[PDB]
Ligand binder design. Structure first.
Ligand code: HEM
Ligand code: NAG
Ligand code: NAG
Ligand code: MG
Length: 228
């Protein structure tokens, strides 16, 4: 069990699979509480080689979720608060309207898996999966909404599971690694994952975000499908 411990009764968790994974490995506080900018830089750096500028940028948004105004920390359960960073049309979570939006949800992940159509997820598969969730949530959730910020996140999130868990150059990621991260909230070291030697930058996230958009082929955009 050396290196990873399931959360326990007093630990808090996020709607984010990576942050939950890093807390479980202890890159972050295992109780998912008291996460500061320096602890975010150090954990994302140590585990994943996220550069400081990106770590700092994500910290910024994370802080806005702490009920206390102008907070210097956040707990993982702050991220679950609906319509700040938590958005509808997640890949692994249900819309808050149906039930809790923070934990893994087999039904919703089943939909997303079905749009990952080979052993290797590429930008096209990633982009398709997100599209179907946006539309499926628009046509089933009467309170379906997605802020400019939420759209930006939703795109960023699909960009992240490729760029950060996979190879950003080729902009591909084995399906097995993504399924494992989502279903175990544990880095898939044993399936081949290795901390990349080259840092993952704000710019790397933007480039993949743009590749996700450019692989959306609507004849007519049905609502917020490209907003950043
Ligand atoms: C401080 C850093 C981070 C913050 C504050 C953060 C925050 C969030 C939040 C609030 C969500 C939930 C949105 C929703 O689906 O309703 C989320 C989802 C997600 N995050 Fe993160 N995250 C961080 C880092 C990362 C990293 C490093 C990765 C990937 C390697 C990542 C991958 C994802 C993915 C794939 C989702 C989508 C889950 C889903 O749609 O079911 N995040 N993150
Ligand atoms: C998800 O898919 C599996 C097939 O892998 C099925 O057994 C399970 O019941 C599905 N869950 C839902 C709620 O559709
Ligand atoms: C949901 O559906 C309608 C299309 O009927 C569209 O006007 C609206 O912009 C969509 N909402 C979002 C947030 O994408
Ligand atoms: Mg959600």
């Amino acid at each position: 069990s050396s290196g990873w411990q399931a959360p326990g009764p007093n630990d808090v968790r996020a709607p984010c699979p990576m942050l939950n994974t890093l807390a479980n490995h202890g890159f972050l506080p295992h109780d998912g509480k008291g996460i500061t900018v320096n602890k975010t830089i150090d954990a994302l750096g140590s585990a994943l080689n996220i550069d400081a500028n990106l770590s700092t940028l994500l910290f910024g948004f994370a802080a806005t979720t702490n009920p206390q105004p102008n907070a210097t920390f956040f707990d993982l359960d702050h991220l679950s608060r609906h319509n700040i960073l938590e958005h509808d049309a997640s890949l692994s979570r249900q819309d808050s309207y149906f039930g809790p939006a923070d934990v893994f949800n087999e039904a919703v992940f089943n939909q997303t898996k079905s749009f990952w159509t080979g052993d290797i997820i590429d930008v096209q598969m990633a982009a398709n999966a997100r599209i179907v969730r946006l539309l499926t949530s628009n046509l089933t959730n009467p309170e379906y909404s997605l802020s400019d910020l939420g759209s930006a996140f939703s795109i960023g999130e699909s960009a992240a599971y490729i760029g950060i868990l996979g190879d950003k150059k080729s902009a591909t990621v084995p399906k097995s690694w993504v399924e494992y991260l989502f279903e175990n909230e544990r880095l898939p070291y044993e399936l081949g994952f290795k901390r990349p030697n080259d840092p993952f930058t704000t710019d790397d996230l933007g480039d993949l975000s743009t590749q996700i958009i450019n692989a959306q082929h609507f004849p007519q955009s049905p609502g917020k499908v490209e907003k950043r």
